[PDB]
């Protein structure tokens, strides 16, 4: 319930839940594929 | 026969062939996109020259040796002088861009050596002297020389420190950002894919930079036996998508 | 008037309670948010880049050359390098991997620990790489250090190696500040036969060193870091 | 979820453990890809790594101190603390600035504690009950010159009235002018020769100036004032490298000069355990 | 009797919360409300309807003569007028306009400035007016101001001219109190051609300005004027 | 939910969302089109 | 040159209207292309028909 008409008067945000590390671990242009050899 | 290795990136009316690749980075998974309405401000319609900003332009060439630092150059700074690109950049009051680094470094299979290339948006510098004092904006604007991190402290200049990377932070955690290296024995290129990352739609080109390529020999340059103890490294770069706006007089910017 | 009651700890902050507040700024309109590349939803989707150790933590002040880990050519048997997993502390300590566990009070989970290698292409070498499991003492020779888990790596034209430190382990959560119960063990590297250089090379050659977490990994009861302090409030 | 699958022995010309680290990617290799693994399940959810319970918490950001006394004859009285501002702020206390500059840009609306405690340090017969005044200055009001100003009135500007030893809170939306803070700007205001670097306004959180509305009794009453800021609904951009050497400003990224090596030197040998 | 614990705030008093309070004159009835033209909802409504800028500042005392910006006959190529655009500051500051902006922290959005032209009918006369968009400097001859956003005016039987400065930003609000990183811009004006007065007439002829906010303005957070103040309360 | 009886201890009034300049920027007797001349 | 060397050169092409360039940052504004020495031993550069009237004269 909340008991404020503005938004900031909210608590706290709930987990993303997003997660998705590829942006900062694998920004390669093109796809590596675990296994296969890293320089063709 | 595709190799990860061989690559061409043609921009405009200037093509770069690379044997000797190691894939390409494209920052936080984005490519450059032009700047949508749902996000714009400003009630401009905005230029986009197109073909004859987005071209590669190669800086001058540096020297590899073995006391070497590394070097820093800012974007859109190192190109505020080449051709129509750094008119427009004079000429608008807002600008904006994203861009393809192409650092280029060849050796033999004899030397050893491996150079870190990095993008970091906001590299905010630190003064040398400490305290509060500032880095003024001659210092942090060095134009196509960049900063040569092994020159001496000037003052009213950023420190030069390179386990540091000018600003605090440690040398071994750059690889937090979009980055590559590039390893004689492996690698003679490296290639990053700049988006326009910033906190607001559109920018001023000349009071802020928004990325630092730098380039910083981790491994020694070791030549072979009674080579010339140094090697070139050449720094190219294209803008890409760049938009102008609000276009005017024509700006005046300290020395 | 509805009749109440009050509680033992009514009127205290507890500054990790989360509740309704009333806006100093009714009705007023934030800026729009527009894209930016990059956001971060959670500290472990960074602690899975890997970054740079300074392994060569031998010098005197801080140095580009405490991440180079130096090879000698035609050593034999002999050992590349030595060190614990508290993953808090020493070696580990100022790496973006170290630096945030150091948020946290217990970690658990897998690490992954990779080596590049720098030296001419003409040259070659093999390498074991070794985990010893909490138990027994850092191995003392190869023989000893090959009992546990290894990897030989055979330096080629693929340049990096990735090992893991696969969680071995009773209990299931370590502590990240260093503590004996909860300690991880060792991880060692040996010339598997040796390195050796072309003609017309010579010197040293050296590997960087890598760390960052599996997927595997979790991090717990968050915390206050030892790896800042001050004296006075800053000021501008 | 499993945390590890059940793998067994290998013999392969598919090696998922030899890469190329010089193309910038971490190859997620797992435990399973170079031992025999067995089955075993995750149990958790990484809740509590999550930016908004990470920068969620509230954390003091600053003290400050006003004292109640008699005025007569002060003829500054900003300068006796008769009252005292504050320009909001997170990089004053290094704690939450070394967290929070993790990121680049980010997002969120504040939630402000204050808590206010008296002190009578000579000879009172009592301990007096007083009344604070906060009053959020947004850049272009009126500044206070007095404790007692017109200014006080704050007819248009947000303020709360607490008393000292209790607690004020209330949350102000994200007031930044951009569509994020940036903590670090590799910018000027304006293409100066001399004009300041880094410190930039569009990290102004706005300000904040503090009295006490009580005259004064027979003794001096010390009150001294701690902000507390918790950041709600949170959203953060562009990762970076954690701060390693000490702060000496707010707002620059400057450290001090010989400072000491940070990375604790081995007792032995790269050998060493 | 139900449960309950009080949290960090209870008792304070915060002038913009919005709650109910008991109604000291319990079942009173108010007066019945009549029509009355001209009600107002939104200081956005009021900040439309233009008027007029002194902005021939130059004298010494207020007076009307700083509302006319006078124009000689015969010169060719020269400036009329200059002025930067910090609405809450100089000439702006006491036109409505100014008036409201001050009552707010951020504004953004376009401005309409025009000129009424009050020379004798039988004259002529061509100005050109020029918005320099943040980044240059107030432009030092037409040649300069024409390269920016400009309107060739005609002086004929349409008395006003309407030029809007449209909102040129990078960032999305600027502050109303002058600031440098959020500066607005400049705004000059020029002979075109030149004043001409028709025989048996002479001197000065003067344009009247005018300022009003475009539909497109936004204007938040707010805050107290630096318009007023006092040092004792009044009385009857 | 108003715990009071009378009308005037309710809290603050919702946002008119009326918003009409037109008795105050065009109060003119005949119409104005924008485009067309002023003074015909 | 022998297998085991490299090498990086720019060709570049200037369309009528400027002089033959002097220095590389004045060639690198036109028509270009880093070539980089490998395995792939020849490089094609074109020249693009550039020019206003259709045709030119051989002599």
Known sequence: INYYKDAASTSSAGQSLSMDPSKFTEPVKDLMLKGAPALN | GYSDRVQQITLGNSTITTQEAANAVVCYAEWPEYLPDVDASDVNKTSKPDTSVCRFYTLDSKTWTTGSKGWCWKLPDALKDMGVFGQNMFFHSLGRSGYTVHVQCNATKFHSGCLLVVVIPEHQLASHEGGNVSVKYTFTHPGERGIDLSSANEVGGPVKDVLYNMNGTLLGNLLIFPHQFINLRTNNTATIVIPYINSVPIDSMTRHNNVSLMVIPIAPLTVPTGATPSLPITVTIAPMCTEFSGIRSKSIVPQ | ?236 | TVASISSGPKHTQKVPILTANETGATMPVLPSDSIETRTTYMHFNGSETDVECFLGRAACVHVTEIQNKDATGIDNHREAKLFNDWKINLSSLVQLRKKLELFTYVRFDSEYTILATASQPDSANYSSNLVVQAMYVPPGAPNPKEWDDYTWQSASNPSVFFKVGDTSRFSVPYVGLASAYNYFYDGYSHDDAETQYGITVLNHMGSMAFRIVNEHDEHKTLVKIRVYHRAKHVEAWIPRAPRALPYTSIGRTNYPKNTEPVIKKRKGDIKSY
């Open chain 3, 1 to 236: 008037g509805l009749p109440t009651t009050t509680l033992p700890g009514s009127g205290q902050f507890l500054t990790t309670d989360d509740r309704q507040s009333p806006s100093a700024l009714p009705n007023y309109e934030p800026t729009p948010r527009i894209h930016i590349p990059g956001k971060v939803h959670n500290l472990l989707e960074i602690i899975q880049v890997d970054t740079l150790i300074p392994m060569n933590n031998t010098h005197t002040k801080d140095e580009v050359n405490s991440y180079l880990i130096p090879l000698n050519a035609n050593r034999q048997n002999e050992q590349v390098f030595g060190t614990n997993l508290f993953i808090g502390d020493g070696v580990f300590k100022t790496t973006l991997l170290g630096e945030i566990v150091q948020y946290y009070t217990h970690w658990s989970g897998s690490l992954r620990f990779s080596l590049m290698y720098t030296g001419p292409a003409l040259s070659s070498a093999k390498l074991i790489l070794a985990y010893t499991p909490p138990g027994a003492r850092g191995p003392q020779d190869r023989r000893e250090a090959m009992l546990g888990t290894h990897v030989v790596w055979d330096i080629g034209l693929q340049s990096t190696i990735v090992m893991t430190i696969p969680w071995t382990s009773g209990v299931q959560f370590r502590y990240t500040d260093p503590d004996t119960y909860t300690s991880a063990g060792f991880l060692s590297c040996w010339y598997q036969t040796s390195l050796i250089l072309p003609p017309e090379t010579t010197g040293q050659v050296y590997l960087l060193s890598f760390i960052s977490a599996c997927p595997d990994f979790k991090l717990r009861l968050m915390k206050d870091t030892q790896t800042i302090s001050q004296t006075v409030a800053l000021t501008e």
